[PDB]
């Protein structure tokens, strides 16, 4: 059983989209039973909130739905997930530092964009953008999630 946790700042725009995309992916590939998939936030500020309505609408445009509610990453997440894939360098920096402070870190922390065959390394925060920015994030997650499933690094 493999595990991936998608992380962003507040867990309402980017990482809920990545989670839903990857869940759709493994389901189509008929291997969802062998994958634990989740998303979480660095911050605790947005905990308990549903994804941004623009993220929900973006996923719906692509026939996807999510019932995720924002949660903050926990010490346990570092000890149990195989991969923690984050969105921007602020996430990476924060995750690398908290990884140092847990004596039981099994997860490999990487930028999700590190898997983009199109080389766009950063998945930028779309909250203060518009719906076309959520579509961009979605397209980034599709390319990155598919590359990740084919070969991890």
Residue numbers in the entry: 5 to 157
What does the paper say about this structure?
The catalytic residues C12 (nucleophile) and R18 (phosphate binding) are located in the P-loop, and D129 (general acid/base) in the D-loop. We demonstrate here that minimal re-design of LMW-PTP, by mutating only two residues, is sufficient to introduce new enzymatic activity towards four different phosphoinositide (PI) substrates.
Enzyme kinetics experiments for the dephosphorylation of phosphoinositides reveal that the RT, RTK and RKK mutant enzymes show selective specificity for PI5P, whereas RK has a broader specificity, with activity towards PI3P, PI4P, and PI5P and PIP2, with the highest efficacy towards PIP2. In order to assess the actual impact of the designed mutations on the protein structure, we determined the crystal structures of the I16K and L13R-I16K mutants at 1.8Å and 2.0Å resolution respectively. In both cases, the structures are similar to the WT enzyme with overall root-mean deviations (RMSDs) of 0.288 Å and 0.265 Å respectively. However, in both structures, the side chain of W49 is in the open position, away from the active site, thus confirming the flexibility of this side chain as suggested from the kinetics characterisation. In the structure of the RK mutant, the side chain of R13 points towards the centre of the active site interacting with a bound phosphate molecule and the catalytic D129. To evaluate if a PI molecule could fit in the crystal structure of the RK mutant, we performed docking with RosettaLigand using the PIP2 ligand, and allowing the side chains of the protein residues in the binding interface (R13, I16, W49, N50, R53, Y131 and Y132) to be flexible. The ligand docks in the pocket, with the phosphorus atom of the D3 phosphate at a distance of 3.3Å from the sulphur atom of C12, similar to the 3.2Å distance observed in the MTMR2-PIP2 complex.
